[PDB]
Amino acid sequence: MDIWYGTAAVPKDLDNSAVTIGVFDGVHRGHQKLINATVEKAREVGAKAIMVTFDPHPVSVFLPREAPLGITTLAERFALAESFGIDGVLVIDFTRELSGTSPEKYVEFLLEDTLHASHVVVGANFTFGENAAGTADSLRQICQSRLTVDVIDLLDDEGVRISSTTVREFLSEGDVARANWALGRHFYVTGPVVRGAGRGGKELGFPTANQYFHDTVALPADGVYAGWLTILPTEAPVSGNMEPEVAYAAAISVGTNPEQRSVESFVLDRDADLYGHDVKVEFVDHVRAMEKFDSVEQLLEVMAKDVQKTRTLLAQDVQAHKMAPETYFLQAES
Amino acid sequence: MDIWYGTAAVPKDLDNSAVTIGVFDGVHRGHQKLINATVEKAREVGAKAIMVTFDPHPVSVFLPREAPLGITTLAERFALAESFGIDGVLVIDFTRELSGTSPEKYVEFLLEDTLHASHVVVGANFTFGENAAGTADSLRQICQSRLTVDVIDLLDDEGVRISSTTVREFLSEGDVARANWALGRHFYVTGPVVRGAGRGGKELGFPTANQYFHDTVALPADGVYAGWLTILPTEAPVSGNMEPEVAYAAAISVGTNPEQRSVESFVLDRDADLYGHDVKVEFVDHVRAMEKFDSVEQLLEVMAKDVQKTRTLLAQDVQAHKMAPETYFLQAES
Amino acid sequence: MDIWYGTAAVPKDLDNSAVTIGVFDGVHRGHQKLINATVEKAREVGAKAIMVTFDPHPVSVFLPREAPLGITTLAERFALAESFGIDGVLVIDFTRELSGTSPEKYVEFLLEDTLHASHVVVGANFTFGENAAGTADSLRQICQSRLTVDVIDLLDDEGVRISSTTVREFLSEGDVARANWALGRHFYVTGPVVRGAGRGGKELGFPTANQYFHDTVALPADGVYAGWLTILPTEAPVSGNMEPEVAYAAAISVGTNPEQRSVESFVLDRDADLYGHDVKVEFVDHVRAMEKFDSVEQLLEVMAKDVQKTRTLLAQDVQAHKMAPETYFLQAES
Amino acid sequence: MDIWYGTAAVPKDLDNSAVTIGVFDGVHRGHQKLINATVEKAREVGAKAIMVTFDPHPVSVFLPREAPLGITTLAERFALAESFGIDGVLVIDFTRELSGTSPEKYVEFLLEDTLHASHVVVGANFTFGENAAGTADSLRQICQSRLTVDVIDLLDDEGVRISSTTVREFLSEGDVARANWALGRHFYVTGPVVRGAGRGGKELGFPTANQYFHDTVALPADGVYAGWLTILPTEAPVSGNMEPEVAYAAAISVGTNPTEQRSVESFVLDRDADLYGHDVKVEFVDHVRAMEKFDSVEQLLEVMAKDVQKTRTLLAQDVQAHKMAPETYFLQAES
Amino acid sequence: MDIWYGTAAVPKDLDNSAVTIGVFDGVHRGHQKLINATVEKAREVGAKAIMVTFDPHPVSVFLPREAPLGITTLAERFALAESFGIDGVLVIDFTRELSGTSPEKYVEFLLEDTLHASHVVVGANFTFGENAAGTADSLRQICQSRLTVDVIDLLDDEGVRISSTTVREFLSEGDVARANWALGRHFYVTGPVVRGAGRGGKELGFPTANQYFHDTVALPADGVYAGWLTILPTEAPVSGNMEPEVAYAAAISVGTNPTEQRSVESFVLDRDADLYGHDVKVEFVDHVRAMEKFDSVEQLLEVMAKDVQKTRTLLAQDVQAHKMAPETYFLQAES
Amino acid sequence: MDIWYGTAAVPKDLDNSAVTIGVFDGVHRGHQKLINATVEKAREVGAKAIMVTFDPHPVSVFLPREAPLGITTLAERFALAESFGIDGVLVIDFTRELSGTSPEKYVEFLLEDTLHASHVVVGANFTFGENAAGTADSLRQICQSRLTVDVIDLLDDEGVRISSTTVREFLSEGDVARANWALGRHFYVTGPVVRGAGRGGKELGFPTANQYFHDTVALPADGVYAGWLTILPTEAPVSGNMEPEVAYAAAISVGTNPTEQRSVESFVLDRDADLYGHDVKVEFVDHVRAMEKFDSVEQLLEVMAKDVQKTRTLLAQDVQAHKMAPETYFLQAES
């Protein structure tokens, strides 16, 4: 998949394309509707399926620092767009271009001159142009004759509107199961593993892996979650008995340094230290709220209940296999 | 009007004076009673009307950093005192003088030796001298024969005690209309305009003017307010279609950087950038609480409702002309 | 009393000992049970009474920064252990030794090889060894024949479990009287006196003494407390009319710098400045919550009520003489 | 004078203009040549004289936080342009437009489509387009028949090149005299006065006025300077015996602090005043001495009085040398 | 290769091993001598070749925050050890064990009880036990009949001692050529690429990739270097015309910042790419120039193009000198 | 000895006094001349001997945060005054009083009204009143018939002026020997011991005691020094084999840190102790060496043992030179 930053980087000789346009944060199930319709129409005409997306977040342009939390990083947005069949992602920066343009000159510049679009697919909530004048309906009439528009209704399921906003609320409440349901997959973060408290190995109280994330990253509420940890493909040696590319059962502690968040993973039944490696942490279910501990004994007792509840939740998760990992490790008991 | 810092700076040959004494933060309506009585008595005897005030706040002397928020800056206190007819402001620093003095030596030093007072006017709440022993009644008896004392009751109106404390509470609650009612004018701040998000001009989402204030400045609760923005007299060029010395209608956003406050002003129906200029922002009415925004579209929709409610509130404000500005700009519609 | 850091510092020729083992934070009344039983048994056999304690807190080993607040400093733990008759304190660092050891090799190494114990006394809550496997009951069976174990039930009195946890909660709620009841003495802090607001002396609003404490120190809730201030033995000159080694009546203000705490002491009926000195502040009773002040007059009025309520509470405290100081100063009135 | 942010804010209405293009930092004497040639030509035709300038600094686009010190603020650049008779300032941001563009499209878009220019005036060092491709020659050729292009060599005078670079050098060495000579006026900063040490009254050692500036502002090397302080027009009362819009003789201490920040402290000669809250302009005339540490009050005051004597002399020369002195001023010969 | 943290994590299972003991920071050419002697001996017997190393740095135990700069990270030390055929790395923390211990107990515990060693290999400078009592001799005597002890002199070559110290010196002076000569390979750092100035596209001045490193990482003196940049294996898409696992010719700017942090900015020659989010390895070949300030865009680009010419030359020599060049690479002779 | 803050705290009761007036920072040998002349005169009459000193430092009133380094704390100034027999210390704050005052009112208010002085003793450099107007002469004339005024020249000895300035210079150069010679005693700091690296036990490299001091405290140049450490009187238990109120031979490392702060680390010779929580006085005798970086444990300990040898020698000389040595001390000749 190609990745272009700004209109000027798009090949001048780009033949023909089917385009979808949005922030696409999270690439949730509604987003997948727009991508599917787009990939299908491109197949039909032998054209390229292009996503136009935005970075930085269009909101942060007017209100810097008060940007919505990133459900996925931009990098993951690329990876997800590829996995669903996008051939090219065009990334628009609204402080460089297309912000002051009228609806008319927007379509003309982006869809025709730049992308040579024959089809375009947007959500019902899509807007464009100076002071957001352009709507999904404007796009229908401006493009009548010139190119075909397909406007997909926002996704409603189980009485919930599925949008970036709802996914963020579910994460913020600690309800990763409902977030996952909206995403169509386990919510996850990826990141390098650093040193933390003691060393990962024989001692149960020491995390197998510690990670930090900036406060722009959306993360579930401080608490303990059941999930899966996967060391990403690597040739670097691994301390202990975990293998790369296998999703390992783990009780995951999300915390806050007293707004930079931490994620500490206790991998079930393994003795390993993942310092240096790149590690994906997928969330499945909430286990408990954060607690303060006043004795080593109390701490470990609770730690063991976390493991117990995690083993239960993960054993269920494996049964919903459209969400579960391909290769996993989960022991039936300790 | 003269401004003296400390007793030692007062002219030795100061003939005769009528004196009022207090912190005078905000110069609210109660304060204006003391000033009026003082200016009138000075007129009568052909003497000077002097205000004795305090900086730093007498409270911050014992409890530094836990000082009351400044309803007005000291500079504005001077300007307000002038506008009501004070000829001289003496500014006392309690860490330099008059804090350890007895009530007796206080009157003797300040009122006679320094200010050659023939009349003095204080509030019923006025205190003075070591450990606040001296009261308004002490001042009556210590000054019998020597000089005339006039003690004005605290101002009560519409079942509210009008004091610096009540004005601060109204501001803190976001009730600027009630604060204004207590002040006898629109609550305002003045300050240099800095660069903010994008550039002021054609785009509705970009503020016309951004300002910052230290956390000692009293400011209404985070939210959106209707008010008036006035570029203070200047010869510097102005970017866009606003003129100096005209009060322009504006939706005003007060925020907090995550305790240094910001004030962002969306001037109605104007395209301007005020970087570099000194700008007064007067508050009239609360519009709404602060909200987080998840789309450019939602942001602008709300922005436009703010404008709508502002136009309404300001059109009413103009009718109460004792509070409204002399020269204003408010369009009947967009 | 000897103080040893780590097993390696204990004399190789240490003859024979009676040992107690725990964190001992606060050395509360439950702790005193373990120490008493230990000192008594050591007397009986002519051996040394040893305390094994832990620093850093065993909890902070797994969860750094999320350590329990220190009811006493380590230094005070030493002083308290001495005052109750401990001959030697061995201080174990769990990041250096004894954390990965099995219950069996723990007893063998610590109690026999290092300390040559003939008796050991632990609480019912005591645990030891890798992943806290070892219990008070494990210690009974592992030591049958080899050495005598005495396991003391947790202390229950007036329907409250007396533990480090409960003392911390009482402090956190501002209930120092209940904390004191659990401690078996007045809760106290010691520390150097620094400059604060103005100078200690004639002015009532200026603190006699200002101190700061790091956020690892347990301290009662922000508020005003009645207590006693004692300048620790010294030959340095004292500004004003306070003598060393006398407990002076004081209204004590605990605050927070906006997590480093402050303690400001208004010594009743004395004019003194304690800059430079080391000062113990004992807490007796809660007086009031913290308030914001908007006038010097209001501030001092409240200050005087604090003094009034303090004089009352302290006059009662003196009557409970097992808790009260040996030499005190409290005036019947101003 | 108008100020437009971006090509899009320029009136479609504009039918004819004489344009000059540069950063114009400092608006020094070389800069004045460009503006003069532009303004006089604009008055010849019936056209408006337009300055195209850049903010953020083009260097900062590539090397953020490595930007050169601003000789003047953007605000003062506007004011200086207006003072030399520019009708419109157009401010280009390179992060928004005109940066990816080829030499060909840059000219047509900016000079023809936006500004509808008939005449252009640039320095010989002038560069434009993608990767600095376009040059003073490159410009003259693309613009045949439609645009009179006047290229002006960089200003050499007394064997010294007068550039923003050269000015920044003079400032940094603390040689304000040469900086002024190159600028055509006294170098100055403007800012609100805040509280400092004590209160401006009878005591010499407490500064009449305190100011702080961001690390972004070019200021002379730490030291003491002779200068003039002016309270900018205001109806706000003044504490002490000073008036607005009079340049007062002052000894000026420039200092630094951990927090970045630079400070400017002004001891005004023969006045007892405290300027807290006013906007004041501080003009620099000559270097007096380097910074030094003090360990007694008497020694500090001894030096302070020597700074005052030196300022009296140097400022008396500035008044006599006429050309750069202020219109209305206050200076005493003796204390 | 296994990695054990502390003696306690070592398998009880281990019956025979050839051991080497050192900090091994940089795994330079002297270090390679120790490892080679160890690995070949281990293959002779039926034994595993074990490296005993230390983290935190032994110096940092006594002088916290005064620790020497890491020539490589602990992670890269592992990877380098594995590349020279070590079977297990045992990592000692001196704050947890082996620090109070006498020479006698140190050997028996570590070499006999834990590792069940038959053979030992150490540098002649090797020190152990309480207060550095144990030495290369001290070691040979305690271990009679059970342990073959091979002591190897420090590597001298071309009249230069090759040590971690010497490498840190070369790096600090910006002499990466000599650092590489001493290491036996190109010095490198590895890290995730983040956002910087603009976007990696057609414009030369915006870096292909930005990286930051803690003050803990030894890096060359601030300046421009010739080097190779490699995108580490990945299925993540690449923006632009670059592939993973190809070393691309790059000019590399090393800089600093208040906040500690060092930066590494890579301008890859003849590619339009933005590497945000990838892990990249940056190899250093030769010093090009010291850092300098710029005050015009044209001058910066003028210098940038000179850096590119210089890189082409220096990298062409590195390719020809064969021995240290990468396996698969991309370099153009002309622009 | 009494300590009064401000003229207002002085007893109205005080009927007669001999007064000395100065900053007295360091209470050096020049200072001792003033105090001796004052104390002996006070014992002659029936009067109390009073020191008028200043806090904050008079310089800091004008130049905040540019204050000279405190040779001693205000607390130690009190203690030193008491040790030379002053009966009352009166502490003037110039931000509260005596600063606006003329020479005439300063004398009458302070010396007559407040202190009811009969006799005054000042240094020849002494300055008072508004803008340093009043001087040693100015003082003698205003005080005829009521005040015996004894002016004492600044102390010159071995061709060296002994002043606070001179002491601060010696300290800053790391020449504590000359600082001590000028002070009349070992320069010292006092402070609570906190945790540092490891635990004070058998291992030489972990300091017996760690201390930090604000940037306000004059300390010797970073380096190693010979000195004596004393645990101040206490009933708190001591970990290790050290007693309170014995000066123990120590090698002392003075260092710095980003965060401002200076550190003092004491390696006490031939003791295994950890002093956490105690107040300790650290006396400086002689400079041993400048600071240096280390890259091996063995080298650090090699140097550490050389510091100890050097300390043994230098401290043996200090004991023999008698005059400045402590009363009760502990020093061993051999390890």
Return the CA Rg of chain C. 22
Cβ within 8 Å, pair C95-E100? no
- Report the alpha-carbon distance of residue A40 to residue A34 in Å, rounded: 10
Packing angle, helices A176-183 and A164-173, rounded to 10:
160
Task: Give the burial string for A301-312 (b: 16+ CB within 10 Å, else e).
Answer: eebeebbebbbe
Q: In Å, how far is D112's CA from the nearest CA of chain E?
A: 24
Q: Which residues are paired to F171 by β-bridges?
A: none
User: What one-character DSSP code corresponds to residue E70?
Assistant: B
Distance from CA of B212 to the nearest CA of F (A): 26
Radius of gyration of chain B (CA): 22
The candidate with the shortest Cα–Cα distance to A329, out of A272, A254, A263, is: A272
Instruction: Give the whole-angstrom CA distance, residue D223 versus residue D254.
Output: 5
Q: Which residue has the tokens 């508050």?
A: B283
**Torsions phi, psi for D119 (to 5 deg):** -130, 140
Locate B262 and state its tokens: 């910001």
Burial E4-25 (b: 16+ CB within 10 A, else e): bbbbbbbeeebeebbbbbbbbb
Q: Is C81 helix (H, G, I), strand (E, B) or coil?
A: helix
C-alpha separations of B236 from B233, B279, E10 in Å: 9, 13, 76
Question: Chains C, D in contact: 3+ Cβ pairs under 8 A?
Answer: no
Chain E residues closer than 8 Å to D169 by CB: none
Which residue spans of chain E are classified as CATH 3.40.50.620?
Answer: 1-186
CA angle at residue F105 from F101 to F107, to 5 degrees? 110
**C-beta neighbour count of B312 within 10 angstroms:** 13
| Fold designation for E187-330 | Elongation Factor Tu (Ef-tu); domain 3 (2.40.30)
Residue D103 · residue D134 · CB < 8 Å: yes
From B206, which residue of chain A is nearest by alpha-carbon distance? A62
E95–C100 CB contact, under 8 Å: no
Contact B235 D233 (CB under 8 A): yes
Question: Within its chain, how far is the Cα of B59 from the centroid?
Answer: 18
Distance CA E305, CA F304 (A): 52
**Which stretches within chain C are classed as H helix?**
29-45, 58-62, 74-83, 103-106, 136-143, 164-173, 176-183, 296-319
Distance CA F12, CA F92 (A): 17
3-class secondary structure, D190 = strand
CA-CA distance, D125 to E30, in Å (whole number)? 54
By residue count, chain A amounts to 334
Q: Which of D197, D205, D295 sits opposite F68 (nearest CB)?
A: D295
- If you measure CA to CA, which chain C residue comes closest to B128? C297
* B40 Cα to chain D: minimum distance (Å): 22
Sign of CA pseudo-dihedral D266, D270, D272, D277: negative
Write the CB contacts of A63 (distance below 8 Å, at least 6 apart in sequence). Answer: B197, B293, B299
Cross-chain Cβ contact C295/B100 below 8 Å: no
- Extract the tokens encoding D37: 């040639």
- CA–CA gap between residue A230 and residue A213 (Å, rounded): 17
Q: What six digits make up the tokens of B20? A: 């009022």
Ordered DSSP codes for B8-64 = GGS-TT---EEEEES--TT--HHHHHHHHHHHHHHHHHT-EEEEEEESS-HHHHHST
In this complex, does chain F touch chain B, defined as having at least 3 beta-carbon pairs under 8 Å apart?
yes
Do chains A and F touch by CB distance (3+ pairs < 8 Å)?
Answer: no
Backbone angle region of E29, left / alpha / beta, with phi > 0 → left and psi within -120 to 50 → alpha: alpha
Amino acid at F50: I
Unique residue bearing structure tokens 């020997």: F177
Query: Which of D25, D59, D139, D168 is the best substitution to test chain E (most E C-beta atoms within 10 A)?
Result: D59
**Two tokens, residue A27:** 């690439």
* Residue found by looking up tokens 């409204």 in the block: B324
- Report d(CA F268, CA F265) in Å as an integer: 10
In whole angstroms, what is the distance from residue D187 CA to residue E224 CA?
Answer: 36
The HSE-up count of residue E117 (CA atoms within 13 Å, CB side) is: 29
Among B92, B96, B102, which would you mutate to test the F interface (most chain F Cβ atoms within 10 Å of its Cβ)? Answer: B96
3-state secondary structure of B151: strand
With CB atoms and an 8 Å threshold, state whether C8 touches E95: no
Q: How far apart are CA F122 and CA F148, in angstroms?
A: 11
Q: At what angle do helices D176-183 and D164-172 cross, to 10 degrees?
A: 160
Strand partners, E323: none
Rg (alpha carbons) of chain F, rounded to whole number:
22
What angle do helix axes C164-173 and C176-183 make, rounded to 10 degrees? 160
> Would you say A198 and A206 are in contact if contact means Cβ atoms under 8 Å apart?
yes
Q: Which residues contact B172 (CB under 8 A, 6 or more apart)?
A: B220, B221
Nearest CA in chain A to B304: A131
Contacts of C6 in chain E (CB under 8 A): 100
Give whole-number Cα distances, B89 to B77, B122, D273, in Å.
Answer: 10, 15, 14
- Using a CB–CB cut-off of 8 Å, the residues of A that contact C are 197-198, 202-206, 258, 292-297, 299-300
Judged by 3 or more CB pairs under 8 A, whether B touches E is no
Q: What is the 3-state secondary structure (H, E, C) of chain A?
A: CEEEECHHHCCCCCCCEEEEECCCCCCCHHHHHHHHHHHHHHHHHCCEEEEEEECCCHHHHHCCCCCCCECCCHHHHHHHHHHCCCCEEEEECCCCCCCCCCHHHHHHHHHHHHCCEEEEEEECCCCECHHHCECHHHHHHHHCCCCEEEEECCCEECCEECCHHHHHHHHHHCCHHHHHHHHCCCCEEEEECECCCCCCCCCCCCCCEEEEECCCECCCCCEEEEEEEEECCCCCCCEECCCCCCEEEEEEEEEECCCCEEEEEEECCCCEECCCCEEEEEEEEEEECCCCCCCHHHHHHHHHHHHHHHHHHHHHHHHCCCCCCCCEECCCCC
Q: How far apart are CA C261 and CA C259, in angstroms?
A: 6
- Measuring CA to CA, which residue among A97, A12, A93 is closest to residue A53? A93
Resolution (angstroms) stands at 2.5
Q: Going by C-beta distance under 8 Å and a sequence separation of 6 or more, which residues neighbour residue E189?
A: E211, E213, E217, E219, E264, E281, E282
The answer to whether the CB of C91 falls within 8 A of the CB of C2 is no
> Which residues contact residue C145 at a Cβ distance below 8 angstroms, ignoring those fewer than 6 apart?
none
SS3 C164: helix
Residue in chain A nearest B299 by alpha carbon: A59
> Are residues D51 and D78 in contact, defined by beta-carbon separation less than 8 angstroms?
no
DSSP letter at F70 equals: B
Closest of D48, D113, D120 to residue D81, by C-alpha: D48
- Candidates C7, C96, C98, partner chain E, best to mutate (most E CBs within 10 A): C96
Q: Report the distance separating Cα A43 and Cα B198, nearest Å.
A: 41
Residue where the block lists tokens 């010497």 = E166
CB-facing half-sphere around the CA of F73: CA atoms within 13 A: 16
Closest CA of chain D from E62, distance in Å: 30
Q: Nearest-CA neighbor of E19 among E1, E34, E5, E31?
A: E34
Query: Is B228:B160 a contact under the CB 8 Å cutoff?
Result: no
> Of B318, B76, B60, B290, whose CA–CA distance to B183 is shortest?
B76
Pairwise CA distance, residues E126 & C239, whole Å:
59
Residue E264: CB partners within 8 Å, gap ≥ 6? E189, E191, E210, E211, E212, E213, E219, E252, E253, E254, E282
Q: How far is A24 from A52, CA to CA, in rounded Å?
A: 9
CATH for C187-329?
2.40.30.30
Yes or no, beta carbons of E59 and F296 under 8 Å apart? yes
Residue showing tokens 């320069």: F187
On chain F, the residues whose CB falls within 8 A of the CB of C11 are none
Give residue for tokens 């708190």: F236
Return d(Cα D311, Cα F71) in angstroms, integer.
36
Q: Which tokens is B118 given?
A: 């023939």
Q: Name the residue in chain C with its Cα closest to that of F272.
A: C9
Q: Are B243 and B228 in contact (CB under 8 A)?
A: no
Q: Does the distance separating the beta carbons of A75 and E236 come in below 8 Å?
A: yes
Enter the DSSP assignment of E290: -
Backbone angles phi, psi at E73, to 5 degrees: -70, 165
Cβ partners under 8 Å of residue B31, min gap 6: B22, B24
Which residue, A195, A187, A180, A184, is CA-closest to A217? A187
Token look-up 């019947």 returns C332
Phi-psi region of F8 (alpha: psi -120 to 50; beta: other; left: phi over 0): alpha
Nearest to C62 among A206, A292, A294 (CB): A206
Cα three-residue angle C92-C94-C100, rounded to 5 degrees: 125
Residue C287 CB coordination number (10 Å): 22
Q: Residue D59: which of E198, E294, E302 has the nearest Cβ?
A: E294
Min Cα separation E211/chain A (Å): 14
Q: Which residue of E has its CA nearest to C101?
A: E8
- For strands E262-268 and E209-213, give the pairing: antiparallel
Contact criterion met (CB < 8 Å) for E237 and A202: no
CA nearest neighbour of F286 among F190, F180, F158, F205: F180
Q: Interior CA angle at C284 toward C283 and C289, to 5°?
A: 80
- Omega of the bond leading into F207 within 30 degrees of 0 (cis): no
Around Cβ F208, how many Cβ atoms within 10 Å? 25
Is the Cβ–Cβ distance between D285 and D300 less than 8 Å? no
Name the CATH topology of E1-186. Rossmann fold (3.40.50)
Q: Which of F295, F300, F302 is nearest residue E62 as measured by Cβ atoms?
A: F300
Cross-chain Cβ contact C293/B61 below 8 Å: no
Question: What are φ and ψ of residue F271, in 5° steps?
Answer: -130, 145
Residues 6 or more apart whose CB falls under 8 angstroms from that of A305 comprise none
Q: If we measure between CA atoms, which residue out of B48, B22, B17 comes closest to residue B34?
A: B22
Interface test with B, best of D60, D272, D276 (most B CBs within 10 A): D276
d(CA D312, CA D302): 16
**In whole angstroms, what is the distance from residue D97 CA to residue D58 CA?**
12
Structural element, H or E, at residue F306: helix F297-320
CA–CA dist D128, D22 (Å, integer): 10
Neighbours of D173 (CB within 10 A): 13
From A199, which residue of chain C is nearest by alpha-carbon distance? C62
**F139-to-A166, B44, F57, F133 alpha-carbon distances in Å:** 82, 49, 22, 10
* Structure tokens that stand for F177 in this block: 């020997």
> Encoding tokens for residue C263?
């303690």
Residue whose token pair is 């890259």: F295
Spatial CA neighbour of C167 closest among C32, C259, C290: C32
**Which residues in chain B are closer than 8 Å to F6, comparing Cβ atoms?**
100
* Of residues E324, E173, E163, E179, the one with CA closest to residue E254: E173
- Taking contacts as CB-CB distances below 8 angstroms, the residues of chain A near E213 are none
Q: Which residues contact D180 (CB under 8 A, 6 or more apart)?
A: D186, D187, D284, D285, D324
Task: State the residue for tokens 């005693």.
Answer: F185
Nearest to C165 by CA among A299, A205, A305: A299
For CATH 2.40.30.30, the residue range(s) in chain A are 187-329
Question: Residues C42, C46, C47, C50: what is their CA dihedral angle, to the nearest 10 degrees?
Answer: 40
Distance CA E268, CA E315 (A): 12
CB contact under 8 A, C198 and B168: no
Strand B88-92 and strand B2-5: the pairing is parallel
Question: Which among E174, E196, E293, E186 is positioned nearest to E249, based on CA atoms?
Answer: E186
Which among F335, F307, F299 has a CA at the least distance from the CA of F207?
F307
| Whether B275 contacts B239, CB under 8 Å | yes
Q: Which residue has the tokens 């027999």?
A: F85
The residue of F294, F295, F302 whose CB has the most chain E CBs within 10 angstroms, and thus the best one to mutate to test that interface, is F295
Residue of F59, F125, F168 with shortest CB distance to D300 = F59
Name the token pair of C251.
């209204």
- Chain D residues inside the 8 Å CB shell of A6: 100
Four-residue CA torsion sign, F14, F20, F23, F26: negative
Residues of F in contact with B5 (CB under 8 A): none
Backbone angles phi, psi at F90, to 5 degrees: -105, 120
The DSSP symbol for C167 reads H
Inter-chain touch E8–C95, beta carbons under 8 Å: no
**Chain F closest-CA separation from residue B129 CA (Å):** 14
- Alpha carbon distance F44, F50 (integer Å): 14
